[PDB]
Design a protein around this ligand. Structure first.
Ligand SMILES: O=C(O)[C@@](O)(COP(=O)(O)O)[C@H](O)[C@H](O)COP(=O)(O)O
Ligand SMILES: O=C(O)[C@@](O)(COP(=O)(O)O)[C@H](O)[C@H](O)COP(=O)(O)O
Ligand SMILES: [K+]
Ligand SMILES: [K+]
Ligand SMILES: [Mg+2]
Ligand SMILES: [Mg+2]
Ligand SMILES: [Mg+2]
Lengths: 459, 454, 162
């Protein structure tokens, strides 16, 4: 088994050059009292490809040729790298294309229940051209949103967004009134992830009231407005019904619609339903639930980097990549590498370089405890603002309301792009300055002398 | 922000919340992150991020919204326990048929709350579904009773279904695969696709399905007994899942009611499970949970346990789900996991925190699998209390010294030994295939039956 | 073309020239002689196109020709070690016939399904036929064949459009 499933003589550069293997890098610890590191890594490769925990009479030479192989170990750093012959992965009968479900079942499936492994988490993976080209990839990108907004389709810049808050509770007309207010100052509105067809806010009534708010805001401002609707369901046919109803209702504003799918909880099947049924609608991948495995506190499953890289292959137009430590959710500054892996044609993960061969980019959607004050620091860490940022609390929690909240987000990115000092910039921008008084604990930490500098009382 | 006043009401009585029938209840083991809020403050912010709030006050909140807030109604900080009540009006329903969706239950009760920067961890150990919400779930349409009927067994307590998994997990070409099916079916009842088996370039789906259909006819002609197969129809594309399923049923023809459909429900998700449940309600839906250990392991302090996963699967309409070997096999499991089996088979059962009435919703079968063999079976059944289930032993059948068929008969004989209350070593002298499992897995025999070499 | 260059293993930016042919005679070749001419060209070239009227004629049934061409593609790819492409005419008056043809081709080609282009006689069958292929099969290269266009586009014509 250590002879069969482990070949540490293989050179990673040759496995990449050969283009016949998917590579996976894991941080793994063997359970005490079982096998050594290479034995545990060999049994892990067996349970992730062609074997079980005992020898079987049915094994032939052909089977041995599709074995996953351990090609590199670094026991001191708990690192194991496995090469998966690409012929292992399932393909559709209908169109010969790849499926992420098969990648998941083999590379991070049954190997997560092994009694002889304490834990194992995937940190990176490499997809060679012969397998990458079989994935859907995104059909709609931020370029399509920039075109609807009248922005340049190359570096069209920042899309000012929000989430309708409360997360649940608003009836159809109060919901649509909050949409109208935000759209007086902002571009994009997203359903909060569970909003759909609740008994107090029926889906068709809310969709119609929002379509009317979009027309009213566009007439008032003379600017195009965008909405991302949650179409998540267990039933594929419910997802189609929701999507079809939205496009028909929005009519001449149908290209202003994004479809949101809770891709981690509903699964890859739900993401593909939206991607294949509505390829001309921006597919917004919401990752609620992902923290159960992606948290740095978890030593199992896979990281947010791996989740995001899979989503690009699945065809997400955009995916939540987190605030990279600048918001309310778990995240780190080094998470900027996630955003570049999903937007660039060539990028480096923690272990593998990836060429995307012209596959469309996936937008990093920034969200979770963001507001005007936290934005300049976020953009400094990332390096660009060609993205969507949604701030629910940061817009509707603004002291002067959602419209002022939307302008504070707009003004916060204009401050960063100009290279201005946020406190100095706030004296000329009322809505941005009023975000300091809306979130005073954040202002005290990020800009310690803001009260004296903006001429406001209290502390 | 301290959201305790709004999102915590520890004066609520659990018995009254259950009697009211207007709330879903969830019990979590939670630890606040050091240097942030106290236990109640963290539990209140958790309830906020799981229902109607965010991390700051918003101008758009009204009294109506406050009425659908999730509420912390019980805390036991010493045992890291938090219980939250979710008004059932929070949960999404289908526009097409007004029915519930597990995706919404997951998004609210174990979604964004798993990324909170002020929580070290939080894992769901139990949940309660009141009648007004339970009745909106699909529940299973096909059960073990339908397999017992195809096998010619009594439809009440029809007993043990002897199964295997076709090993190698991947690598077998279509005819060698079907030859291993024929061999096992000479002694056993049920064969399962190993979870990733589908349309690989070396074993095309249609060729494998046709070769297996021919092996089923040959084994049934030879033995005079009905045989069952569970095919993996998992795909990202709903239409691929339909194409696979439709092709299998048409090919199997007069044996179409001998087919189960396997879905890798944890990796492909609830959407894939529902595709199979709603498109093929008359085909036994076999929920394979590959990947689940990333959250269900006792080593994980996040997500949800295997008990919670299994209870959701029954609501989703799984006919059967892998419940693990309860510590008797190769995967992580514990003897107390027998409570998982009762929660999914009985009409009334107790979880670690909540009693559940199922109101006649069909049972889900415990599918026992993962490092099982004829030697480990009598101990497993003693712990569970019955054998009205499917057990699949891949290595335990194809790893038997005399082959598949002998492997199958040792699984059959091992359950017959348990039902008779016989001593396995004494029983083995009269049952050759059962005795030859001792020599097939000698390390297991040395631990379970120390003086067997005789 | 970037998607064809990727299947050919060429750079996806300026991947260069795709060497192609049309299976002649325009009509008359039975399924195996047709597929034998595909195999021969593919020993030296990249792309083969159905001549514009080739489909389901009584002497070259569609399913038989599609299967014989799928076998010739596998044989040429095994022989040369290079990827090969085919553009199939799926033109029909009936939208559902266009879907049946396309679906049958993709299922038959299986692991070579991304080597398939769909040809539509867009000028004679019309924009409705072009959109059927574009919307039903957006991941298959849509090859617009303009047979008939000369009736208006010719410089001799002073009507219609160029
Ligand atoms: O429900 C929420 O909490 C949010 O709407 C943010 O609202 P706020 O702006 O008010 O905080 C998003 O779903 C989270 O950002 C998801 O986290 P992530 O992006 O990390 O997946
Ligand atoms: O691939 C495997 O390992 C198995 O086929 C068992 O094969 P063996 O009989 O040879 O061990 C099953 O998928 C596991 O039982 C899944 O674990 P669980 O039931 O816990 O979901
Ligand atoms: K090496
Ligand atoms: K209480
Ligand atoms: Mg949200
Ligand atoms: Mg398996
Ligand atoms: Mg021609």
């Amino acid at each position: 088994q250590s002879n069969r499933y482990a070949n540490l003589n293989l050179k990673e550069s040759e496995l990449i050059a050969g283009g016949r293997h998917v590579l996976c890098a894991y941080i793994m610890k063997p359970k005490a009292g079982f096998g050594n590191f290479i034995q545990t890594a060999a049994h892990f490769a067996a349970e992730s490809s062609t074997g079980t925990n005992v020898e079987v009479s049915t094994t032939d030479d052909f089977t041995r040729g599709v074995d996953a192989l351990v090609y590199e170990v670094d026991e001191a750093n708990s690192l194991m790298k496995i090469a998966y012959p690409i012929e292992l992965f399932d393909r559709n009968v209908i169109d010969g294309r790849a499926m992420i479900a098969s990648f998941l079942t083999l590379t991070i499936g049954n190997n997560q229940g092994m009694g002889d492994v304490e834990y194992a988490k995937m940190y990176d993976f490499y997809v060679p051209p012969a397998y990458l080209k079989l994935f859907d990839g995104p059909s709609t990108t931020i370029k399509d949103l920039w075109r609807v907004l009248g922005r340049p389709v190359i570096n069209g810049g920042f899309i000012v967004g929000t989430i309708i808050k409360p997360k649940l509770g608003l009836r159809p007309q109060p919901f649509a009134n909050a949409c109208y207010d935000f759209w007086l100052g902002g571009d994009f509105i997203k359903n909060d992830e569970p909003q759909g067809n609740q008994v107090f806010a029926p889906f068709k009534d809310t969709v119609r009231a929002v379509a009317d708010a979009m027309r009213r805001a566009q007439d008032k401002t003379g600017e195009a407005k965008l909405f991302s609707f949650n179409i998540t369901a267990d039933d594929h046919y419910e997802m189609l019904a929701r999507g079809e109803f939205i496009l028909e209702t929005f009519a001449d504003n149908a290209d202003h619609i994004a479809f949101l799918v809770d891709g981690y909880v509903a699964g890859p099947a739900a993401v593909t339903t939206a991607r294949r049924a509505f390829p001309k609608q921006y597919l917004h991948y919401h990752r609620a639930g992902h923290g159960a495995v992606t948290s740095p506190q978890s030593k199992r499953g896979y990281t947010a980097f791996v989740l995001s890289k899979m989503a690009r292959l699945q065809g997400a137009s955009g995916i939540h990549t987190g605030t990279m430590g600048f918001g309310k959710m778990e995240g780190e500054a080094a998470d900027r590498a996630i955003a570049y892996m999903i937007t660039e044609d060539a990028a480096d993960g923690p272990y593998f370089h990836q060429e995307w061969l012209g596959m469309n980019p996936t937008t990093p959607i920034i969200s979770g405890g963001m507001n005007a004050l936290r934005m300049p620091g976020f953009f400094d860490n990332l390096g660009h603002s060609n993205l969507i940022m949604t701030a629910g609390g940061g817009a509707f929690g603004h002291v002067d309301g959602g419209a002022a909240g939307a302008k504070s987000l707009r003004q916060a990115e204009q401050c960063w792009k100009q290279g201005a000092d946020p406190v100095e910039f706030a004296k000329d921008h009322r809505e941005f300055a009023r975000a300091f008084e809306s979130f005073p604990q954040d202002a005290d930490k990020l800009y310690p002398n803001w009260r004296a500098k903006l001429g406001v009382e209290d502390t």
